[PDB]
Design a protein around this ligand. Structure first.
Ligand SMILES: [Cl-]
Ligand SMILES: [Cl-]
Ligand SMILES: [Cl-]
Ligand SMILES: [Cl-]
Ligand SMILES: [Cl-]
Ligand SMILES: [Cl-]
Ligand SMILES: [Cl-]
Ligand SMILES: [Cl-]
Ligand SMILES: [Cl-]
Ligand SMILES: [Cl-]
Ligand SMILES: [Cl-]
Ligand SMILES: [Cl-]
Ligand SMILES: [Mg+2]
Ligand SMILES: [Mg+2]
Ligand SMILES: [Mg+2]
Ligand SMILES: [Mg+2]
Lengths: 423, 423, 423, 423
């Protein structure tokens, strides 16, 4: 019987050396599971609240209050529940907290317990996590959307686009797709050395060279793909996270490379589509620019995937508003933006039912936890955004997808160019 | 370890007294599961082939060849496989057969093994079948689309529409929705007695009274809903299976109540939408009328759900062609039209990803097997078509949904009017 | 019974996106364990040989030959052995290979199997890995020697010292020591931003700012410690990896910041000891400069720990030669330099018996594997070198030490300033 | 789970027929273990206190108070602890007692519980005791230091040296080394019969013939080695326990064979090194003669192992003082001198880290318990002092080393002449 017996939490460090929550759940059958919670560098206004300790300790970023909340309140509210009743457990966490944004117990305390319970349920059932969450039909390995060059608020350069990604869509399999991603990243390291540009890594393991702007960054990436013996677009296509909220002024406009309107940003993005093998653009406009996004999606949404991150925050409520308004055609899925597995899967359901694609995403503050790799296959997103093929908080996810591919055998299918029908 | 050890089959009878396949699978951990295969009265041209024995025995409808195929060939090909690898098992069945339409081993032999393996995997994992297929997020109880009055090729009347269904969309829960369906069906029995019309049941448990046509049948149903103390549309809405292939002549047109064109049938259906609280119409045109369907879906598809049954036959290939052509907005899901659980779930995936709704369906020849009730919740269709609340091959499904609702507790949600946003 | 039943290997990626070996071992009692192998960016001449595939794939760095060697040859030679007989298993791996430097099967294939077997033995015995390797007396949490600023061959600067580390020796506990390391690293990020220097990370997660030389780097670190509210030396002391082989010419001398002799390098190092709270210096001279090292150890060895890395390569044979010659007073312990757990522990034994201290070390190419954290406590080194508190291939080790500290309860002791009696 | 459930004690007799403590521990998984406590004939001033009953019974040497202390107080303080947490259990015993020298509960009550818990933990983990204490690297069989001729306070003769030992350093294996020890002991019996000297045994199973002094005793032993067909020094070397405290007067000097100073005793010992194949001398000076020992160790410590017994009493505190002062180069390890396994292993750690060798030792009052044989291999001392190859309280240890050698197979290594690099 997979009845919850014990729930504990501890403070560990994330991949930027800031504290985060790790939760362990033990079931009465001796099943033990452990889940760690990611954290964003900068966050959407609309995200679930992380409980942070304040004061001097770790710059105010301690999570001892979250840890105490798991031991004093969450444990006692969920011990005796069946870990298979993920929706009951998640509803009891949400009711316990009693707030819209999980500001009392913290989204970080609550997601910790939610993910650990799911992991314990899967172990008890003797099923791999992808198969317990997705059922026996879970088999699709995601195209890895790999951040290899950074800009925006995440850089000390004149590039305002936050992330430049490669997507090995033409690969026959996920094992070959990871290798393609790795070989282009290694060749970009060599191209950067040869141009005398910096090869220091950012948070996501990508390079942050000081370059002129968006097209200069895309040209270096294209050179890297060719240098790896691969064809841009057919083999390795491109994607962006503009994260346009970071360069947007409330009620004013987009300060980009020139102040521009939503419609001008769209002309820019349209220009990039004509010049480059772009399959996806994330957050091309800001998190509350509902009019701009609708007009942009109407303009270019037939030609490229448009991903809502900060505009949706993995929230069914804000995503429903977007589907209604014809805003974006894809949802970035961040479990810690919403706080429970159940609410994450309701958002994925709302998207998938509504014709929108999904992309599972890391946070800039990640851990050795690989659960999003299992999530990406469980929900059959066909797309994952979990960093450069460097820094093991990113690579551990890619290694877990290798293991999932191997375990599926001839049942595995790599999403490849079927993730992006518009390209 | 849920390794397949034994696979046996026997000939049993379906709900019309014709033979069908039942398969039992035993795993090395002592797990035992049993699955029975439904059969259609009349079938789509494009369905997986049922192996039938021919000769005198049971009118040519014996399934001893299918039973022998399970023992001589399928068992030996899948023993030693892990029952958790549903896609490997289904691929090995499809490769074993080696034909497009499963004409060598039979769709009936193959689906038997496929469904029994899935059931055995769920038992081994100690999970209810809905939760093993759908994962921990499976929680949505379907609106029951209950056939209470028949016509077409299934009748001796002037009604050409095959099925008239009630849909208790306004109910707060599936337990109340089943009761509403039952009380309207009982009141329709009383209305029919009072009009001197026949109360003999058809295959699906609905009545087949000799009435004038479509609007006469809808009026009697509306009287029944009011007689039960319920409001037509707000509480109990209406749906149809025209099954228009049954009154279509190849290259000619629709002989309906008058020969009509696809566009004329659409004017008729449009007329019914203005006069009646219709939420869904299945097969309004014939199985290969791709032009007619596109024009109909363009005309009324914003106003009502349009379900493809015979046009799609639960086939990813034919459904892809429909999505491309803007044909229908819903897929009728019939596991035995395609032959494996895996191919059924790929069709559901293709639909759900593509913005199309799904409705799990019985066949006119059903069994005491309740697996489609678990399927409807697993895939979160929000809709099931499994007969009148009479004849236990129909009622056993409704009873299994009660048990699933009870087991989910406060996690259960009834789809209600959210299954039909267009109404 | 912990009899080895199955041995498998797969190619995964390390923290620099290059391939490495991961090995899984299953025992007949159902115990399953997984071990990943690290890889050095540049290597000592004397290290165990890594089998690499060559050709185009992953730049020649594929490990498919190593993976095949684990499946074709190692598995068959160790299945049926008791996983508790670590020395028998390691001797059978060494005899199987039949070469001095493990050049036939590869140090990477062999260490994979060695570490996985040890992990499986610990799981079977139901003991944490630190307690199975070190016995019930294992309780000492290491001072973390955290690389926060890089130079040498690992940089594009004028600093020739490869690694600048902080050592929180004055902390009351490992949990406080990790926090001190994290807060100084965060304050160094702020000091670097304020001097307009690069905050891109190197392989070990440290910063690589373009600075003048050794004393400029030490001054920035000292500013960071003070900025964190900590006292240099008393709270946070300093350590170096000169890696002097990287700037040494065979038979010629040390090109450093000026060509210098071994004795001149020693005058430099002696100067740094008078000016800075240095507790340790690794590889102050080159890997085969036996005369230089003896004279340096005689000169300053009473005043500071002198660590042999490339001079010893975790080899009992080369370490014995050093003890005999009065060369160094500490051994850097790198399991993959020697290839088996058993030979690693014989080197630690030879050192500890001989009055030499040990420091467990990461490689620049690391994985999500945390086994060296368990090793550092098992052998009671009191010292570990496993990166900056950034990049989870480094932080996962620090998180595992937190978990080990918590599990020991009041039995835990933090090595603190007792790791460095000379300071 | 190896949780302590029951702790009982009984009074048994030691090898001299005096009472001692035996402790049994039962764990909740059904593991049962038994440990007996040795006792010294005469003791160091600084040893842990043995609780003795006083009065008439067994000459005042009853241990009923110790037995009662195990049942009334120790059991209740350690039941519910994990037997794997040896340091927590030992700390709880030390805190319970609350005294420096364990004078309240008794070192004999406390060591009984400590050793039984360790044995129970090893059984629960299904590991031999040497492997549970020493980890998988424990493999070194000790040179047996076998007392074959006695003098001092342990005799009625003019020999003031307490123990004359043979050390079969040249043997290829422990099985051959035991045989060499046995054959020399049998030949010494024959040499003694032929000189008309007594063949009655002392407490340690050695002979106590009435001889002239030290050189007369060494000559008889040398004759015995030759008579066995072995070469003195190359095959069988010699060692001494002077136990010089027994012939030392507080503040006065050494009454030996002549009153002598520390420096004169050293001239004597130096003379014996020139004339005889001596590898080790234990307690050459008295337990508090810190100046004498330093000067002696400076004089001859390069030429022979100098073992501290009564000067260290297996106490980390007194051993630290010796390492600081350059006093001795080896620690005699007597678990009952300190009272817990944990404090014994901290003393071994302090020694081994500090370049000092260890020799595990029996007490003159021994039992059928063989645990020190497992300890000697666990800590890889390479040396054990556990009597003549006569009297089964001595031989049971040698028999247990045979069993440990056999169980290690080709992983076993005999320390041989590598235990004594100075010879
Ligand atoms: Cl919820
Ligand atoms: Cl869309
Ligand atoms: Cl998707
Ligand atoms: Cl298939
Ligand atoms: Cl649609
Ligand atoms: Cl649906
Ligand atoms: Cl070896
Ligand atoms: Cl030294
Ligand atoms: Cl050390
Ligand atoms: Cl202690
Ligand atoms: Cl020494
Ligand atoms: Cl030793
Ligand atoms: Mg974003
Ligand atoms: Mg139909
Ligand atoms: Mg180094
Ligand atoms: Mg003694």
């Amino acid at each position: 019987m997979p009845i919850i017996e014990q729930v504990r939490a501890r403070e560990i460090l994330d991949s930027r050396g800031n504290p985060t929550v790790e939760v362990e759940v033990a079931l009465i059958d001796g099943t033990f599971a452990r889940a760690a919670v990611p954290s964003g560098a900068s966050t959407g206004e609309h995200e679930a609240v992380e409980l942070r300790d304040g004061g001097d300790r770790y710059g105010g970023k301690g999570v001892q209050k979250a840890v105490q909340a798991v031991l004093d309140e969450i444990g006692p509210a969920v011990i005796g529940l069946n870990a298979d009743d993920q929706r009951l457990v998640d509803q009891a966490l949400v009711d316990l907290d009693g707030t819209p944004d999980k500001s009392r117990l913290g989204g970080n305390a609550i997601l910790g317990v939610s993910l650990a319970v799911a992991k314990a349920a899967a172990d008890s059932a003797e099923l791999p996590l992808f198969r317990y969450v997705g059922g026996p039909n879970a088999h699709i390995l995601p195209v890895p959307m790999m951040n290899i060059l950074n800009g925006g608020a995440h850089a000390d350069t004149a590039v305002d686009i936050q992330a430049f990604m490669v997507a090995p869509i033409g690969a026959p399999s996920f094992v070959e797709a990871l290798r393609w991603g790795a070989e282009v990243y290694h060749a970009l390291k060599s191209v950067l050395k040869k141009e005398g540009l910096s090869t220091g890594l950012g948070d996501e393991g990508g390079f942050a060279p000081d370059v002129a702007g968006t097209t200069a960054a895309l040209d270096l990436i294209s050179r890297a793909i060719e240098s790896a013996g691969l064809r841009p677009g057919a083999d390795v296509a491109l994607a962006l996270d503009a994260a346009a909220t970071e360069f947007f002024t409330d009620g004013t406009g987009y300060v980009f490379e020139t102040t521009r309107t939503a419609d001008q940003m769209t002309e820019f993005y349209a220009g990039l589509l004509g010049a480059y093998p772009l399959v996806s653009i994330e957050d091309p406009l800001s998190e509350d620019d509902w009019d701009g996004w609708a007009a942009l999606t109407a303009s270019i949404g037939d030609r490229v995937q448009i991903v809502g991150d900060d505009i949706f925050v993995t929230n069914p409520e804000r995503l429903e508003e977007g589907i209604e308004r014809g805003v974006a055609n894809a949802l970035l899925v961040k479990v810690n933006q919403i706080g429970t597995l159940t609410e994450t899967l309701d958002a994925v359901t709302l998207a998938h039912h509504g014709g929108y694609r999904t992309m599972i995403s890391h946070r800039s503050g990640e851990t050795e936890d690989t659960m999003i790799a299992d999530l990406a296959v469980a929900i059959g997103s066909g797309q994952i955004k979990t960093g450069a093929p460097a820094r093991s908080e990113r690579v551990a996810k890619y290694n877990q997808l290798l293991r999932i591919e191997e375990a599926l055998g001839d049942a595995a299918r790599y999403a490849g160019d079927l993730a992006f029908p518009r390209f």
